[PDB]
Subunit: 137 residues, 2 copies
């Protein structure tokens, strides 16, 4: 109903001109866009995104990539939008993703994988609050 | 490659799920997205946008529809982008538009013609300043 999810087109996804493609697939699914913007994330913001990999190898490499160019931030809304989001995006690692999904169709690298989606309603609410102010939504 | 144009998906375009399709056509064309937001315009914004049409009998209906729901605002950057904007969108009146353009493929009505595009560079200048702050154009 009023369930929401966060979708981000990463710098590689924007540079490859995949923004419209991704938006269109959520539109085709019948979902509603209630927040949308473009920004080059700050180092502090990228760190926040990969927050739980803080103590893993080459965490700065990921932060660097994530803030290397503008991304497109989105909030979609509708029944089961979070689950639909991962169905549409496909497996996080393109090696496991199948054809017909975003990563299946366009992604190869597991680091630079074109886009991100919340994996839960839990993570969604956190992610949306981080990138958007309440008035933007 | 610094010239800019202003593109807006009108409320009809948004409801019919045409945002991705329109953005995709500017990406394929090779242009750079440098500004973006989603907003339902106020009465005053719609009026401000169609201000040169304030004395036309169809003005209020135009203001009512343009402010009836969310629109998606866009600035694209590059050589000839204002010209290309017109090329991709097609004639403002869908009855004059060709298949292959946004209006040719998706639009019927003059009022509900899916999307707005700057018709000229200086018009792009005004429209861009009207809808965006300087810190919104990446």
């Amino acid at each position: 109903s009023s369930e929401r999810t966060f979708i981000a087109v990463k710098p590689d996804g924007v540079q490859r001109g995949l923004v419209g493609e991704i938006i269109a697939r959520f539109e085709r699914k019948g979902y509603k866009l209630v927040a949308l913007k473009i920004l080059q994330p700050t180092t502090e913001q990228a760190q926040g995104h990969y927050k739980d990999l803080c103590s893993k190898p080459f965490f700065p490499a990921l932060v660097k990539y994530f803030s290397s160019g503008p991304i497109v931030c989105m909030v979609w809304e509708g029944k089961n939008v979070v689950k639909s989001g991962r169905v549409l995006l496909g497996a996080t690692n393109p090696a496991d993703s199948q054809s017909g999904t975003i990563r299946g169709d366009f992604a190869v690298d597991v680091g630079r994988n074109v886009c991100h989606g919340s994996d839960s309603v839990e993570s969604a609410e956190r992610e949306i609050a981080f990138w958007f102010k309440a008035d933007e939504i």
